[PDB]
Design a protein around this ligand. Structure first.
Ligand SMILES: [Zn+2]
Ligand SMILES: [Zn+2]
Ligand SMILES: [Zn+2]
Ligand SMILES: [Zn+2]
Lengths: 132, 134
């Protein structure tokens, strides 16, 4: 609830640092020219954003998994040289679906929690979504 | 010590309003376009200004009071046609010194007081003192 460096209320949010800060941080050279807001001014924008992200990921993950299970059902009938690559593909899908499970878990937490939960480090996960 | 509206520490100063305010005052629509500073950024100059004013008024006061007593001393001695004018001059001095006493008292309050006491409405009292002569 209070700034480690200044002891003032952690009520502001710095977009560039993706960090909740206090009014004295905001005046300081360390955040000079940064875009800073009350958390309450940006919470709803960020909530909407992550919500839609969560929806997109859940679908993308469902779709990945139906594909994965089709590749799984396909392995038995298939010849060897095809079998190996399909299994590799399934490996890749497993990797993807894991990654999306982690992302979905973080988005659910952030969307269920406080504003500070919502916002703190939020650029990290936004960029992880981008990097898919 | 704390903002009457937001409960935050009163550490900032609005130049257009001559008002002591907090960081939540500062960022609101009411002051966003105003020039705001930490009190501590402007305090020394204001303190010096009010001390100088105080000294100047102390001297103008001394001078008026001495004249006032010379007139008072002269009145008994005076002929009929001078007495009226003397009485009146003494009155006019009485008023001037009263006004100066009030100004001096406010300056003393401000110079002895908190930073907030110093700065709240400070442009106002400066201007009223300037206006006496000009
Ligand atoms: Zn801080
Ligand atoms: Zn920053
Ligand atoms: Zn305030
Ligand atoms: Zn103002």
């Amino acid at each position: 609830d209070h700034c480690a460096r200044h002891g003032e209320k952690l009520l502001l949010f710095c977009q560039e640092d993706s960090k909740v800060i206090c009014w004295l941080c905001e005046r300081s050279q360390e955040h000079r020219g940064h875009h800073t807001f009350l958390m309450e001014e940006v919470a709803q924008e960020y909530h909407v954003k992550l919500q839609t992200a969560l929806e997109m990921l859940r679908q993308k993950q469902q779709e990945a998994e139906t594909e994965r299970n089709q590749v799984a059902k396909r392995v038995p009938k298939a010849p060897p040289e095809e079998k190996e690559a399909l299994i590799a593909r399934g490996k890749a899908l497993g990797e993807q679906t894991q990654y999306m499970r982690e992302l979905i878990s973080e988005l659910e937490h952030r969307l269920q929690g406080s504003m500070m939960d919502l916002l703190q480090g939020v650029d990290g996960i936004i960029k992880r979504i981008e990097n898919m």
